[PDB]
Design a protein around this ligand. Sequence first.
Ligand SMILES: *[C@@H]1O[C@H](CO)[C@@H](O)[C@H](O)[C@H]1NC(C)=O
Ligand SMILES: *[C@@H]1O[C@@H](C)[C@@H](O)[C@@H](O)[C@@H]1O
Ligand SMILES: [Ca+2]
Length: 306
Amino acid sequence: SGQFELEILSMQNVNGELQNGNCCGGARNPGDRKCTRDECDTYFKVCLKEYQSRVTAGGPCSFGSGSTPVIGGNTFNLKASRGNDRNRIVLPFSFAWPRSYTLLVEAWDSSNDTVQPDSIIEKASHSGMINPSRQWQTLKQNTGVAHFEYQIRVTCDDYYYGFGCNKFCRPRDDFFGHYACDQNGNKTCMEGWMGPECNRAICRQGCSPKHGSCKLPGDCRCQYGWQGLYCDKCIPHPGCVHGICNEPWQCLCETNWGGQLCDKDLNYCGTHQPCLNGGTCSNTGPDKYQCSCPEGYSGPNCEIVD
Ligand SMILES: *[C@@H]1O[C@H](CO)[C@@H](O)[C@H](O)[C@H]1NC(C)=O
Ligand SMILES: *[C@@H]1O[C@@H](C)[C@@H](O)[C@@H](O)[C@@H]1O
Ligand SMILES: [Ca+2]
């Protein structure tokens, strides 16, 4: 989104003549050929269109057209003046600025009280190249009887960048992005954000790429069944005692532990030493054993004496 602006700087028509050779409304004085009966009522028409190597006099004003109201007589100098809504033409555009253009600028005499219509004083035309910039470029139409000067520029609208004023960037800090804008309209992510729109939170250094995730920067939220600072430890089956997991909800037994919960001792003899009075213990199953009793002892643990 941009604007092509045109400002009138000066007009000099010392005798008050039209392009056709006649005076701006009135009779020419025989001899001195001075136009003394009236002065021009000078206004300007502007036509902006696509580049033409061979500039046509007519045709459509594709990029826009405009006119100023009457802004002075035969001669006026606005060079030391500021320039207001009356002596300037604004031509907005929403298409990417093509750099190349054709510009028609004409000085006209107003006649809205007499028999004759509005008549052209002088015409300027050219084709050129212009990039977005706040800097004005002066152009002078000083080849005919009436001379005029004007300045032009192309400016980008707010948050627009590049040669076509077409690249949009407005800084943001919400669920659509967390960034600032470059001098080129590029997005520069706030600390803790990544991706083209700076909308992907950077997770805790070491966060599991398989089981860890983000919503806010610096965190590590675990996938269901995963735990730990880096979400890289599985959660064993609830109820698991002497077992481990490689995957969530597993209960893989440690040595000499049995059962789905790894709570059944396969070395009851080693852990409890239940055979009393010099008896020998034998592991025979989960939480199971058998005692072989010396002479004079009886019972499951050789506890019955005599
Ligand atoms: C930065 O801006 C330039 C000019 O528009 C563009 O070519 C380039 O791809 C941009 N870089 C990034 C990271 O978008
Ligand atoms: C196991 O069996 C019992 C009866 C005793 O003889 C022990 O010394 C042996 O280790
Ligand atoms: Ca007039």
